[PDB]
Design a protein around this ligand. Structure first.
Ligand SMILES: O=C(Nc1cccc(S(=O)(=O)Nc2ccc(OC(F)(F)F)cc2)c1)c1cc(F)cc(F)c1
Ligand SMILES: O=C(Nc1cccc(S(=O)(=O)Nc2ccc(OC(F)(F)F)cc2)c1)c1cc(F)cc(F)c1
Lengths: 544, 544
């Protein structure tokens, strides 16, 4: 009974005396382990499996049986587990092994339940829910429509709030809004269990998502609503529609830009080449890429009080046509106009089409890789940036590893160790003349859990851009003089509870400053607040 | 809540109306399936996995989530699932993936709990337990001592009673008696959770197993105690110690011989060469091999009332020295003396050492392979048996497939389709001149579940050899004139519920005849009893 409840089950960590008192002697093998010992054992069971998917499968069974031991194992091996319990293994689990999510707590909405969303939420009988992750399985990167099987993404993202910021696992809810799927295999699959129809048009999409947002605000009024893995046709428009009326954010848009900005500003500090001296090529010009550039500018403006106009003029935006300029003769998308050069002639614009010739002309000190078109940061291009700065900042952020603008290894090799690198993926260290270099990974885990924990405590009426900017600055500042001396751009991933506690404290203080905080119990000074936030976090240890 | 209880959970088989009434709308994807549809889906999820162990792993997750759907899938695909859910996959799961059994109901005994066995049983809080499978992980075949990890064998054997004879899954208990392990890897393994010591001596072994047998008879008085996968130093002695005082049997010894005897007698019928005309080489002379020969003799004596002495003289026992004879000049083990030739000279015995020369001299009509020494039934040997009968009976029963005396394919090929074959493993059909041949598999599943179900209903004071002989004859008789016309030696495996119902009926009637039956509610005429037994069986269908 104790054993069959994954929240209180301790398995072999029940002492002999506990086993007699609880009447479970002879329900376990006789060895008694500490949690630490159970973690080392589970870690061995995981590494016995070869393929990421089989490792995920084993971990799902641990989560089903002993939740405390699951989260304890993730926290002890976080850098190594991350690619198994989320991107990119979780997407493969959704696409071909969706049965791995059947047993998980989860809430399914579709048009058949129109008008009943609030009843379905009430019926789930959750207490004071703090975090709700919602997807429609459409995919931010637009690859592999998962439809209903998108529930696996919400389940995996919810587990990262629990591991990263000690959101209590009983107080988090994964949600799929099934509005159909354009996945042709799934539409013909006899074993697809979701709505077997093409994705709904915008009017019906927004009718169901409006009902979702209103139901959640009434039935789960304490919750942060986080949008995950929505396609580009909707994700930006969703934030515009809801950002002021509901407590909501989108991690792919707002999280990514907070994390990259914090790392980029620490790269600037190590470079010696100060922010107004940086010449930054933004390779890629989607809404997301422009969003990150704007987040870098907003952060440098907050931290340093340079005029934001002067920071915007450090950016050279490159789209598929070439350098984005006002003299190019094309009609620019709204999002490209802000970062468009005003200082480049029509004649020069005509000769600024390939990344090689753009780099030669611009003489950048930074390359930001947000391009999603493979390895465009060639050896020749990296050698040219070496002419312009002693410390080239090179950020190949396009995912996955095959779409990356350059390998950290090549970046370090070509610069003889001078490159300051951040990556969107983990990479092993590179050694050059006995000296070791490792890229700093801008993982989204640095920001969303702390935002969730801060918004859970502070209960703000909404999440304005001030709170994401505060979280970005908080993260930047947690990189210690020592971390910086070793070339690290972020605090260490394995210190995520402390990082989340700090990010959360800083978010609450910003909400208090703006007077949007609904929880009057919280300390309002940083030292006392930080202590309070750390005590509020759920810890994966045997409690009782 | 309904969903988290594996006994009542129906998953997607809950109708839309049921989902509203039970307040679980939005806890499932929206498709509604019948059980049949769920089975086809689970069957596809299983075949997506390549290796037997990964298939077992998926099935363990089904068993954990929806028990009705698990048993429904096994029953629909029984011949194909059998090698995944028991021998030989289950042993590999015990040896290297013992975590697959952690979540299962199971009872662990060891010397540390001496004097508390009855308290541990009471504390498990089972109702009217019907079947208890116990092992010590020593292994009947003496390969791969599993120690504590032997619990996986008891768990898999218990699932075969539920699938085979509709023992209610709540009324069956898997047990490991951990008396240590001689597995050197395990003794040094930091993740072994069992008693980390060499196997106890006989005196302490029997102290703990006596306490087990007495505790079970008091706390689980309705149960059949089945011994599984005990080593040869103990398994025979255990039956001698307990057979009269407790309701117990050993499937490896008693089950195997019941199944092989039933098949062998049907092989005799197809051969035309009647039982007193058979000349049978018993290749292998362990206690087990001799037990099977004695079970064949006892069955032919029951069915046909030939003097058993005349049946015993149809057997030519071959041990590692050669033909077992009284003139050989060695001191015979007790178990070999019964089947020893009295009709062969010292001089002939000296020239009867190789199987080839023994076959040439004996001119057998049957070869029984119980030898465990690879493929000794050579083409030359099979050609010689063709000189002695138009229908050679060839039974390569040694496990696994590599230790087998001959492949059914070779047997059929070498005899041009004349061979009557039973196997200890499933084999695909062989086609010769457009005519198809398939060996009859003597699976233990034909007998133990029906014995368990019969002993569960009849509640006999004990299980004397009469009840195993009745079960053997029952099985033999269920092979229909039609089955026999197609060369089948057993009723079809997929008809296991009917086979178990019949075997059980016949066992009860024998217990009633002997007046050892404690349940006075049962019909005492076969037609009415059979109907009653079928109604008592738990069925893997959604009930409520
Ligand atoms: O908790 C139980 N058993 C247990 C036996 C050994 C060890 C442990 S443990 O908690 O100490 N370790 C552990 C756990 C589960 C894991 O995942 C996996 F392997 F089961 F998939 C891995 C390790 C736990 C248990 C739970 C029940 F609901 C019923 C029951 F009868 C037993
Ligand atoms: O039963 C639940 N979900 C379910 C979702 C789709 C289908 C089904 S099903 O029962 O129709 N099929 C099915 C099942 C489990 C299987 O095994 C495996 F994949 F989970 F390992 C395979 C198939 C079942 C469920 C159980 C809970 F305890 C909590 C919860 F929130 C949901």
């Amino acid at each position: 009974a104790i054993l069959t409840d994954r929240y209180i089950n301790r398995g072999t960590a029940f002492t002999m005396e506990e086993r007699q008192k609880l009447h479970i002697l002879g329900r376990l093998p006789p060895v008694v382990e500490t949690l630490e010992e159970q973690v080392a054992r589970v870690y061995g069971q995981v590494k016995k499996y070869e393929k990421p998917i089989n490792r995920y499968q084993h971990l799902v069974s641990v989560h089903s049986t002993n939740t405390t031991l699951y989260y304890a194992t993730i926290l002890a091996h976080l850098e190594e587990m991350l690619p198994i319990i989320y991107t990119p293994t979780v997407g493969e689990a959704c696409m071909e092994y969706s049965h791995l999510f059947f047993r998980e707590r989860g809430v399914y909405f579709n048009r058949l339940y129109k008008g009943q969303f609030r009843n379905i939420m009430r019926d789930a009988g959750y207490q004071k829910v703090e975090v709700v992750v919602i997807t429609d399985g459409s995919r931010i990167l637009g690859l592999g429509d998962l439809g209903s099987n998108g529930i696996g993404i919400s389940i995996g993202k919810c587990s990262l709030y629990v591991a990263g910021a000690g959101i209590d696992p009983r107080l988090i809810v994964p949600v799929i809004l099934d509005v159909g799927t354009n996945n042709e295999r799934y539409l013909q699959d006899k074993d697809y269990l979701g709505m077997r129809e093409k994705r709904l048009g915008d009017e019906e999409f927004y009718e169901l998502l409006d009902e979702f947002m209103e139901a959640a605000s009434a039935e789960w009024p304490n919750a942060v609503i986080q949008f995950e893995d929505f396609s580009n046709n909707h994700c930006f428009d969703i934030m515009e529609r809801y950002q002021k009326k509901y407590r909501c954010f989108n991690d792919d848009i707002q999280g990514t830009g907070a994390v990259i900005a914090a790392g980029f500003l620490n790269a600037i500090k190590l470079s010696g080449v100060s922010p107004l001296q940086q010449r930054i090529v933004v390779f890629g010009a989607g809404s997301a890429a422009v969003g990150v550039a704007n987040n870098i500018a907003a952060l440098a403006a907050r931290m340093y009080k340079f005029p934001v106009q002067d920071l915007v003029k450090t950016f050279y935006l490159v789209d598929t046509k070439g350098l984005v300029t006002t003299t190019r003769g094309d009609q620019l998308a709204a999002h490209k106009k802000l970062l468009a050069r005003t200082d480049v002639s029509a004649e020069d614009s005509a000769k600024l089409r390939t990344l090689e010739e753009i780099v030669r002309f611009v003489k950048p000190t930074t390359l930001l890789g947000l391009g999603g078109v493979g390895p465009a940061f060639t050896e020749e291009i990296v050698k040219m940036v070496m002419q312009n700065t002693e410390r080239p900042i090179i950020f190949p952020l396009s995912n996955p590893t095959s779409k990356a603008e350059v390998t950290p290894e090549n970046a370090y090799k070509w610069t003889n160790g001078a490159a300051i690198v951040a990556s969107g993926s983990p990479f092993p260290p590179t050694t050059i003349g006995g000296k070791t270099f490792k890229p700093s990974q801008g993982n989204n885990l640095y920001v969303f859990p702390g935002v969730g924990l801060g918004c859970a405590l502070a209960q703000p009426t909404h999440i304005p851009e001030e709170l994401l900017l505060t979280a970005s600055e908080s993260l930047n500042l947690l990189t210690t003089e020592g971390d910086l001396r070793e070339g690290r751009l972020y605090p260490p991933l394995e210190d995520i509870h402390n990082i989340s506690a700090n990010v959360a404290t800083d978010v609450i203080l910003e909400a208090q400053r703006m007077k949007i905080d609904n929880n009057k119990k919280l300390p309002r000074t940083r030292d006392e607040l930080l202590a309070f936030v750390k005590k509020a976090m759920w810890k994966p240890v045997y409690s009782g």
